[PDB]
Every structure is written in structure tokens, then in C-alpha cells.
Amino acid sequence: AMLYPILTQSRMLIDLSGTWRFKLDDGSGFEKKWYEKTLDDAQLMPVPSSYNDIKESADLRDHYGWVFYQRDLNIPAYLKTQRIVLRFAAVTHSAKVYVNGTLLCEHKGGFLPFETEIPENLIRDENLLTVAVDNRIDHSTLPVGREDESNVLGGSFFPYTPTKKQNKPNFDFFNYCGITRPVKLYTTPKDAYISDITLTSSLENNTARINYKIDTKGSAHTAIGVYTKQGVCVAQTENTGTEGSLTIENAVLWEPLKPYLYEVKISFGEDRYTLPYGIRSVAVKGNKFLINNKPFYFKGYGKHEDTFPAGRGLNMPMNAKDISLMKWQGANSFRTSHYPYSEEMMRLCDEEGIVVIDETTAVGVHLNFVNTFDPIEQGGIRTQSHHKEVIKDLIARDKNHACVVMWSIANEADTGSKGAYEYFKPLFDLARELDPQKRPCTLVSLQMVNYKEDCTIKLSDVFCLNRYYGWYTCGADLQAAEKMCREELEFWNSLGKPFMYTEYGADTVMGLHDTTDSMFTEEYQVEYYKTNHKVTDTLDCFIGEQVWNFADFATSQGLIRVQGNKKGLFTRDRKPKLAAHYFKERWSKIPDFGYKK
Amino acid sequence: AMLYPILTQSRMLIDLSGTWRFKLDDGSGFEKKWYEKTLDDAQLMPVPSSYNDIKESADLRDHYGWVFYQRDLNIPAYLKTQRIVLRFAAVTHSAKVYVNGTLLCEHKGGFLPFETEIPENLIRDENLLTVAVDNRIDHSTLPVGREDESNVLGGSFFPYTPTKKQNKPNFDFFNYCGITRPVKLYTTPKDAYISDITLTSSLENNTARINYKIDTKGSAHTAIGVYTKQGVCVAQTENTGTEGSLTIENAVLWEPLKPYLYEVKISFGEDRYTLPYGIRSVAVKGNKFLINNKPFYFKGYGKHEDTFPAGRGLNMPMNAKDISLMKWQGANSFRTSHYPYSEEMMRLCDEEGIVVIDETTAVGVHLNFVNTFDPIEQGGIRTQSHHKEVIKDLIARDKNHACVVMWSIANEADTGSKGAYEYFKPLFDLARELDPQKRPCTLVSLQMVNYKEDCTIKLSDVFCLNRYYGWYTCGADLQAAEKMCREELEFWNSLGKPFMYTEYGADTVMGLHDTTDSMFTEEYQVEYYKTNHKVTDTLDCFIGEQVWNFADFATSQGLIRVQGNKKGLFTRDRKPKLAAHYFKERWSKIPDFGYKK
């Protein structure tokens, strides 16, 4: 259970972000127990931020292993009358958290929150908070790191021996690590408090019924009230226990680009918590993706959390800039490729009416780009257990978001190979079991020669395809790209279920131009997209287009990465390429609902 | 025999360059004998120029097969008292030349001149000159085109069927074709004229002895005179026949960056011809490359003939700009990668004191990047016969240039495989036989794991290496690049013979930057070069550094070509990247002679 920490009449909220001490592990930090004392001979690092790009050091950017963050934590003893909690919104990839040299918690998974109470007895007059952060990835982590597998995107013409041991990402984006999202101290009443809130809605005529389950610790009485934005109470139930329901007459529905959030206020004993909440329905019916019973057409992007110089770190001005650009362009949606995004972004999307495909950290689950899904004993991928935990934690965090309409279980896994169905079926079953709203589930399909053998066909409610007709195949032959595109997409269209692009694009360096089709130029990016839409616009089961990518982003180094991935419609500093203007024109003429009715 | 056409007291020179008619072959141009009539429904094309980039049409740029050029040729009948010659400086790749629907000549080889007399009887009051130009390349052409071999640099992740049949270059640079260099009509006396001039020099104390052989047609008397730039006669011999010698007291030697050209004036009957000529010696001795008996250090580049929009076409303002930039940067030399350059450039290098490594068209002689040098019956490369002709014609054209100090027999052939020595030994023997000055010969060595098996070791006077330590291997690991560089180059240094870099570089997009080593940025280009020089500056047999490339240039399309090849020190419009300033500083501090003495 991970409610977003907020300031309330029963809950303090103390941000610990700022300038922290920082030290690379030299192989002796745990042996010499650096967490027991002030870090010596240390640097300074902003928190929240990825650490890789803050300095000018390749040894720091390309570090392998642990680093140690630390700050002083001097708090009033009178907080000891309350329950005291340290919340880590995200520490990438793995964390060990120490207060005064006592290990308080550990966490695996770099993109979801975790928390620990501080035992009263540990809090001295002066305290040290130390966070050790591990950046290493392998066959057991999500995202996956290679072990003996070859570098496909960053391969040399002639092999060489690396100077130092390094991570081997099985994914494109740069392995930004550190204290990615805010660290905060918060409090709740000690004896009785709210641990979780679950809300589902049903629309009977113009009356919404909101079913609630309020999970609590301790013995007290539970109450719930639903308020309009302007502050009018529209439903209230007292002494309701855990489960109940209530109704809102003439409810205002949350719609894409037309958001409406009620405020759901909960009391339990002395505890107070307010959750914003939008009322909307999601259903797949035939080849339609229905939001509030209307056939939606996705217009948008796969994104990354990527800005300079914080890397993956929470950047709230850029989040607001990015949503503004989305509305400027006529987009209505994006996918959280390839990890859960910050709660601050997710809550902002609820407020702004941006639809979200919420995706796990499960990218790189692919050992043949020994079978990927062989038994662990025979060398198969070792991620399924953690994959289950990620699904649990992602849905627990994001279940109440109106903006989340579909779960993406994995990106570009080896879904055309033997054992893939056996790996994924329990994960799809888990997502359907745990999501109270029973939203659609998908996996994001890698381009593959044997596409009819993609186990997505047996599992997903929507088929989500990553396809690069005119880039990774048919480059500079867009007539051949159109023919190859049509041949495959007519197969998917024949299945009668909704399908969409979750990735399609062409690397494009701003400022490169040619009137005559030429890879990496701004004009070719436009022609690539025109060619694909010639096909997709004729297919009635094709219900959405999300480009790769919203913006240029950092990646590992190699011969096909021109200082990162250049498939953005915008540059890394959010400037529009020619194709950004193309999509503004195109999306201006396509309705959010009823394009393919 | 191909003397450069000049205006003299016995020789008219009439340039036919300008706007010509132009038509793509549609498969019927020879059947319908388009050369017999004015081209119908034709476009217009500048001559000289490559045709590929003049318009905005991909079908034109990527044309496969023949095109037809044509112009009117209305000349005075009184020229019929003279011998009338049509000179094609270069037609890329193969040509058929028609006057009034009579086929006058055909030529194979896109980068060397050819000529034909016009029979008096064919010249009507009004005439048509038609040039059919073939762009097709295969296992029998230089440069080599692939037939069934795979595309290594421009390969897709997923195979596709091309829309139309296209050339398959076995080389990086774009396959620019057309009437690349000027077409001119010239005249000589009919009955007796000079066909060729051969000069060699010997330095006895401060006296130069110039040995001459004047090849003529007809019966007349031969005379030769050598004049200073200011016009003083310094040697003269009359009625000398074909072979002879003469001496120049206190001769001014041609030196790199300090050129001096005498004027050698020849008369034969009524014919007059003037050849510029620099006096200098070239010899390899031990690990030294001696120009005028002093140990030279090459500083410069592999170039291309490449500008926008003419492609490969002769661009005389840019030739002068390029030499000016070379002198600005402190360079002393370049290689004509990967084909003979225009006579206008070669004569300008003589005038300006730029040293030249003169290279054949033999790039792509490599079928395993069936053995490359298997017998033709078993599928081996079919180029050796034409390769011999190219060597003959290149040396015949350029033998008298002081600026030419070494012949490059081939670039990046399969010289580490069986049969390579057997293929190349006759070609090296031919070059040594035909060059009157017996200049050094080399081949330019591809980077290869089995470098000790490179047959260059058995054939070349100088070992010329193309090496990409820190780009195609060890990318973004320059410490590993330095170690791998040193390990291999210490082998070459142990052989005791002169060796050099003819290629080394890193793709660099102007305007991309990072303080921290990152491929494709301007800073990484500098660090790449610093790392390599750390090694080469410590090796006493390493006698020269020529970067890849002088300037960004156009290539085929593919995932590793960011709108062409970006390894230029300068952009395509000749603007300096950071590394251009690095080399200006570095070469400013390295003498042309006696750096490694």
C-alpha cells in the first residue's frame, strides 16, 4: 500500500531533497561501514537526480556498482508522538537505507516507491541518513542486463577488451541511476491511520456509484466524503468500516483533454487524507477501445523520463512543459516507456486530462535478440518473481488514476519463442486479479519475422505493436516500407481486436535536411510517418498511434546512436522538428473519439 | 598517351561544357537509337557535373543503368585542315560516344580521360554529340559493385525486397555518375604532332639533369627548351629525336609547400606544347621517406572529390578553397581516395606545393567483408585485367607531376586472404615498370584481425594503414583504444620500414558536444585523435598521418551513415569542426621534414 504523501491535518510532510553528500564505492564502503559515520572525502550531489550527468567524469557516468548518498537528519523529538515514516519515491536500481548505522530497509526495483518507519528508539539528537544505491543489472533485474549475450546495437567491427567492468544494458535508454525521485519524511497518527484507499465507479444513468475499500491499521471509525472542485459535498457516509459504496447524482465524468477530479476526503480516527479522483469507464468491445462508452483514438507517444542534466530525475517544470506541448500538438495520450513514471507526473496527467498506458519495468526480457524462457536451471531469464512484484506494486500505486486506461506488462520481450506464453500468462492473470477496475492489459510487441507466433495474440486485450517500416527495414525505400507495412498490418486487422502502434519512428538530427528521401533528415521523418499512415488510416481495427519518441533521449554508446536516440518529434530541449509540426497538423484534424466508428 | 589539353600556338582548345540535354534511359534508348536524333522530352543538365543531386528526384538520384547526354556541335569547316580531337576528361562509369549517330568510341573506367579523333567525313554542317553514360557496377568494375554479397554498412534488421533494381556499392562513397569532368574539342597539326612527353631528373651537385623522351606521330624535327617562371631559358636542345637529356645549372628544386615549376617547351614540326615541371627526388631508404634526400613527415588527409550540388563534378573554386584550408591548417599532403582526381586539381597541387599519394579506382576488391581471389571460373573477382589498364592509364596521365610521390595500388582489398599476393604482384610489377621515376608503391591496408598476414608486407615500399582504434573498435573506450593501437603498431614499427596512417577518424556531427567522451560529438573527435597520437608519436617508423576525412561527404544510405560520412575535419561546406582547430595547432608544431630523424 503506497498512498502518495500529502500534507494534511493529521500528517506532516517534510521533503529531504536538496544537496546531499555522495561517494563512489571503491570496493570497501560496506566493509569499512561508511554508513556509520559522516562520509569522508565526498562529493556533493543534488537529490532528486540521476548522478551520472551532474559532473564531467566518465568514470562517474560509467560507474559499475554501489554509491553512497548521505545527509544529516536532525528532527524535533516531539515528532516521536507520531508514527514517523521515510518514503523513497524511487531509488534506481536497488537501495540499502541506514539510519545511524542501523540498516532499516532494502529495496529491489528502481522505479517504484518504498518506505520504512523509523523506530523511535533509533532517533538520537543528531542522526545520519545514508542511502546506498546499486546500479548493477543482470538476468534477474528489471530492466534486464546482459551477462554473456552480445551487444547488438553497440557492437564493434572488431572485438576489444573493455578497460573496466561495466553494465551491459539489454535496453536502449541510458542506465541513469541514483536517488531518482524525492525522499521525504512524513507522519501519521500512531494508533490508527489510513493505509490504502481503493475506488471503483459505475455509471447508472447520470448517477455514478463509487465503491470504496478503505484499508486501515488500528481500531477507529471510518468516514468518506466526495466534494466538487469548488467544495460542495455530493456524497458522504460515516462509520462505514472498510468496504462500502455511495452515489453521485449528475456526476461529471473525467474525459480525455476535459478532466474533472472530485476530492475524496477520508477520516479514520484522527487521520485525514484527501485523494483526487476522476470518474470514467474503460472497456474493450469488439475492435473498439471505449472510454466512457465512446470509441477512442490514441494520439501520442512513447515517452522517457529524460532531461538534462538530471537524467531520469524528477523535473517538475519539464513535466508541465511536456504536457503543454502535448496539448499544443493535439495529442491525447502517452505510454510510460519503459518504467513507472513519477507520481507527480501521474497526478498531473489526471489534472490535465492526458490518457496513460502504464507500463512495468520489464524491458529486456529477451536472451536471443539457451532460450529466454527456459527453466532457470537451464539458464532462462530469472525475472518472473520480481516481475510479479513489480505488477503488484505498480497497480497498488496507480490503481485510482482515471488517466491510466491500460497496463503494459512488458516491452519487447521474446514473445515469439517457446515458453513465452507460460511466462506471461500468470502475469496477465495477476494484473487482472489485482486491478479493481479490470482495465485492459497488453504487452508491447517487438518486431519479428514470425509475428503470427507472438503470444500477445493469446493474452492481450489490445495488440500494441512496435514497428519500424522505413527505418530498421526498408530504410530509404518507403514504397517497399508501405507494401511490407500493409502486408503485416492486414493480418492484425483480420483478428477483429483493437490494435495500435506504440512505437514507430526514424532517427532525425535537427538541422539535417534533404528534399530527396535521406535517412536522418527532418524531411525523411515526415515522409516515414506519411507512408505509415497511408496504411494505418485504412485499417478499421487500428485504434491508436503513439510515436517513438516524444523527445530525443540518452542511450548507451554505439555506431547507430548519434548521441543518444534521435527519434524524438522534439529535441532533448523540447524544440519541434519538422515532424512535430506535421503531427500538430495531422492530430488537429483527427478527433479523440469517433475517428473510426 | 594523354597530355593535358592546353591552348598553344598550334592547338585550339574549345570547351564544350555548359548546359546539355539529358534523358534517363527507359530501356529503349539504344533500341530506338536516341543518339541519331535530338533527344526528345529531355531535361537539362550542367556539364561537367554528376547528375544525381542536380534535381529533387529520388528516381534520378538512385537511377540504375544508362542515361543520355547530348548537345549540338556546330564547328567551322576550316578546322578540317587540322586534326580534330574530342577529349573526355572523365565520364563515370562507362561511356559510348556518338557523333551524328556514328559510334566513335567507348570507354570503361569512370575517373580517367579518353579521347577520339573526329573523322573529317563525319563532320556535317550541323552535328549532334551524344554521350551515353552507364552507372552500373559489379565484380568486373573498379570501383567494385556487389552481386550476391550482403550489405554490411547498410543492412536492415529485417530483410526486405527493394522496389527497384539498384547498384550495390562495395564502397562507402556515393555512386555519383555522369559527365564528371570537362568535355573539350582540341586540335593539333595533322601531319606531325606531339603525343606524349616523359621527364625524369637527376641531381648532380647543384646541377639537375632532365632526361626526356618525346613521343610523336609523323616525321619532323624535335626541340626542347626549359624556362624559368620569369622566362629565362636555362637549357635547350634542338633536333633531338625522341630521347635525350639536358642539364640545369643551379636548379631550383620543387619542395612541399615551397613549389617551383619550370616551363618545358617542346616543338615538333608545327606543333607546340608547354609542360610545367618541378624538379625533385623521391626515395625510400630504411624507415625514411625521402623527398629531396630529407625525411618527410606526411600531414594531411584522405580526400574525396565531393561538393554540393555537383557531387563528384569538377569544382575549381572549391579546389582552390580546399588547398587554401590545407595551408591554413598546416597540412602538406593528401591521398586521392579512391580514384584519380581531376587534372586541374593535380596541376594546382604542383603549383601550390601539396604532396599527393595518387590512388587507383581499385576500391571494393573484397568479396568476404567463395574467396575474393579465387579463379574467375570459381567466382573470384574479375577486375585484374581492368586493374592493369587503370594503372597504365593513371601513370601515363600523372607521371610528370612533382607532387605525386607514391602510387596506391588499391584501397582496402582482401589482402589478408589466399591468392591476394598472386593478384597484386603483377600490378606492383606493372607500376614499377611503367613509372619512369620508379616512385614508391603501396596498397592501403584494411583493418583486419590477421594483420600480420597482410600481403602488403611482401609488396609495398611504405605500409599504409587504415585504422579506427576508438571508432569501429573500442568506441567510447579510448583507454582500450590506446592499448590496442600500441599492440598492433609496435608490430609494424618492428619491421623497420616506413609506415603511416592513411585513414583514422571518428564520425562527428558539427554542433554535437559533450565534456564527457561521447561518440559523434566534436570533443570525442579531438580525444580520438589525441589518443592515437599518444602512440604514433613514440614510433620512429611512423612517418605520416592522413586523417579520414578532409570533409564530410555523401555515401549510400544506412543506419550508420548520418546523412553521409561525418568523419570530416570540415563540414561539406568546408567549415572547421573542433578537431580542425586541434590539427591546425598540432600540425603548426610539426615540421614537414626532420620530425623523426
Ligand SMILES: [Cl-]
Ligand atoms: Cl528505450
Ligand SMILES: [Cl-]
Ligand atoms: Cl529505436
Ligand SMILES: [Cl-]
Ligand atoms: Cl569512401
Ligand SMILES: [Cl-]
Ligand atoms: Cl569510415
